[PDB]
């Protein structure tokens, strides 16, 4: 599965379904320019035990929050919407997702 095709209402708050499958972490990232040899931008960063979104002066107010993670939904200017899979027992053995919207 590189892809994920999810429905939600335009420009409202969604929490994305995560594809990624049992026993494999989560992270979600923009690719930047959707291009892969571009860099992923992290979204969400721990602080004391709890997960908030980064505070980019750039992304605006895309990442509604990431307890859980919710966008507003509509694909991300600056990039695609990446979630990086990362089997449990071996970090340099992921898959990266793609996330794209369908509308209500
Ligand atoms: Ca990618
Ligand atoms: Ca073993």
């Given at each position: 599965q590189e892809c994920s095709l999810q429905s939600c209402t335009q420009h409202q708050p969604y929490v994305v379904d995560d594809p990624c499958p049992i026993h494999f972490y989560s992270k979600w990232y923009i690719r930047v320019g959707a291009r892969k040899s571009a860099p992923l931008i992290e979204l969400c960063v721990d602080e004391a035990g709890s997960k908030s979104p980064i505070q980019y002066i750039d992304i605006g107010?895309?990442?509604?929050?990431?307890?859980?993670?919710?966008?507003?939904?509509q694909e991300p200017k600056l990039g695609s919407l990446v979630v990086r899979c990362s089997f449990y027992e071996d970090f340099l053995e992921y898959h990266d997702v793609r996330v794209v919207l369908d509308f209500i």
């Open positions: 107010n895309y990442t509604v929050s990431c307890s859980p993670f919710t966008i507003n939904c």
